[PDB]
């Protein structure tokens, strides 16, 4: 059993009011069964695209989730993951102004 790592990053330089894409890249986990949510101000984002699941040279799995978003000054984004390796869901917040 292996714990997922999570990295959250935007496709383009974040500009408030400008359409962009936020990525949540989830890696190093096993077994391959996993639930990934992207969050806007603590609420699940409905339209989130998932890449096909794949795996690395060390056999650990990875997958990319992404969603279209327009950054504002006050909106906060996160990626929350549920996996059998963890008793509690793991949440990582988008860094921008942290």
């Amino acid at each position: 059993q292996k714990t997922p790592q999570i990295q959250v990053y935007s496709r383009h330089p974040p500009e408030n009011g400008k359409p962009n894409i936020l990525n949540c890249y989830v890696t190093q986990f096993h077994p391959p069964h996993i639930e990934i949510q992207m969050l806007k101000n603590g609420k699940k984002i409905p339209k989130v695209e998932m890449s096909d699941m794949s795996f690395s040279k060390d056999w650990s799995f990875y997958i990319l989730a992404h969603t279209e978003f327009t950054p504002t000054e006050t909106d906060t984004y996160a990626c929350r993951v549920k996996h059998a390796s963890m008793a509690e869901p793991k949440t990582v917040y988008w860094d921008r102004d942290m």
Partner: protein, 271 residues
Amino acid sequence: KNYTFRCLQMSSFANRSWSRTDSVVWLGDLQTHRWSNDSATISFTKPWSQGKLSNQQWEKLQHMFQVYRVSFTRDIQELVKMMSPKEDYPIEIQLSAGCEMYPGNASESFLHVAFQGKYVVRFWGTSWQTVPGAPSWLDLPIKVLNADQGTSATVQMLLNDTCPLFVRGLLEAGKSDLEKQEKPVAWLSSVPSGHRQLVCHVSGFYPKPVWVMWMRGDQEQQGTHRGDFLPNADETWYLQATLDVEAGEEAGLACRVKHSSLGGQDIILYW
């Protein structure tokens, strides 16, 4: 130059009546195929995913894989049945097969198998073999498998002939994608950890190789910490390089980015 072609199979067995097998295929870092469990046919993820194979050649190849997928699932469920309660459910099996292409017309092929996240079995030369330290209960089933000369011959054909043949065709047909150049866009921010961590973000570049460094004038800052290559969803890359800096020492720092797409014209951003 060097290209690795990887067929990646992911099979999950939760119990007697629940299994799924999904596959993806990669040429270098570009996905060429996807084969979902709930699809009868292999799906193309590029215009050129059929390479230089004729429709008939592809159909023959696909049918073999279709037969294989059903056969593999039956064989494993039967292996588990005759393995109670040595190693029971859930069971994860992964298979990684393909060939690495080298300058000239040379290549080396591979077929590796992992059980519960651990490498246990390879096909090598003319036979399946367990790797040193693999569970001993695998010995007899691998010997049984090795008695199937039909499967052995087919695997030999696939690794020795079919793989490099198919990949040569992919490399010709996929040339404009494989040799594409996408320009990085960079930006600077900071995050916590008085010290601050300065961040140089580099995004949207292709191909993968890239040089990112924090600089004070001509001096490379050896505190520069490069992260991992992270994929964007549009077949480009993302990387960041950080530098932890004392408060009031930020002035004079720059991030320099070198990339093949920029033709010698580095991006330089100033903090």
